[PDB]
Design a protein around this ligand. Structure first.
Ligand SMILES: [Mg+2]
Ligand SMILES: [Mg+2]
Lengths: 177, 177
């Protein structure tokens, strides 16, 4: 098992393109990922109730099956996350449907990953939700991550809103209107 | 999807070692696989009732997740089979258990694969069940496969018993006594 702990910011200003310019000198670009996620639900156990998620991701052609458990924090996005790469997205999707899972919703995004010391900064252009930043810390406590994010937004003059909602949950709310 | 069609023989005589000698000249050895399979069940949908199977296989370190559907034939072992390779057995097993699946039983065997024209002959040493042969045909109808197996056992003087039961089912019956 693995505990994924990150902070998610909804960017108000400036654009991600401008933010990319402000970090370009002191942050090292890692890669850009085009991610297409298919989320699933269990008809006999509502994941929206138990705060669980099951996702089949296509990121630059690499196919990843991810389980996510209930949130463990209110101040950061902290969840158990178990991931395995699979050989074929179509077939894995078929197996889930043969086992009784139902496709729920789809999330597509362009993620740009940057590295600063032990932190990973993800600049996220979410289709239909807008611009977001996710920050993760390697071997970092929740206090350290919160502190670094505060320095990050201040140093780069980012107006923002923190949220612990997943992209799947934000998409649903954005679809309400 | 994919329809796996094979004939399974319980070998009465001679030994698989002796059978290996009788086919050695005209059959080409492909590989030998050490296979450790973990079977699963769904508590809300009994696979023993619906004739389904879910298996995580370790074959020479390669990890394969396989769904198998209900049998479609009475004269050969014919089932829908959807397979994907996954990166990590432990993690995939965890995901299944997090999703509610329960490990059912385990099957371990040494499989030796041979090739004759469009047919694959598998000599199987099943731990606790004994010696078996499985024969599969590439682009072969059910009539062709049955006919080839009849020639195969006759040419190599194999005493045998055909069965359409899966190894999981045979293991359960063998455990009854
Ligand atoms: Mg995230
Ligand atoms: Mg078989």
């Amino acid at each position: 098992s693995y505990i994924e702990r990150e902070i998610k910011l909804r960017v108000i200003s400036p654009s991600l393109e401008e933010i990319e310019e402000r970090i370009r000198n002191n942050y090292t670009f890692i890669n850009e990922e085009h991610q297409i996620d298919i989320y699933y639900n269990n008809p006999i156990r509502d994941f929206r109730k138990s705060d669980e998620a099951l996702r089949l991701r296509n990121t630059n052609g690499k196919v990843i099956l991810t389980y996510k458990g209930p949130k463990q924090s209110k101040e950061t996005k902290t969840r158990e996350e178990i991931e395995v790469e699979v050989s074929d997205l179509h077939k894995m999707d078929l197996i889930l449907r043969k086992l009784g899972f139902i496709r729920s919703f789809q999330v597509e995004k362009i993620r740009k990953n940057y590295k600063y010391a032990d932190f990973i900064i993800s600049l996220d252009s979410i289709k239909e939700l807008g611009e977001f930043i996710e920050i993760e810390g390697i071997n970092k406590t929740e206090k350290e991550l919160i502190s670094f994010v505060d320095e990050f937004v201040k140093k780069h003059q980012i107006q923002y809103e923190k949220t612990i909602k997943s992209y799947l949950e934000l998409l649903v709310e954005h679809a309400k209107k």
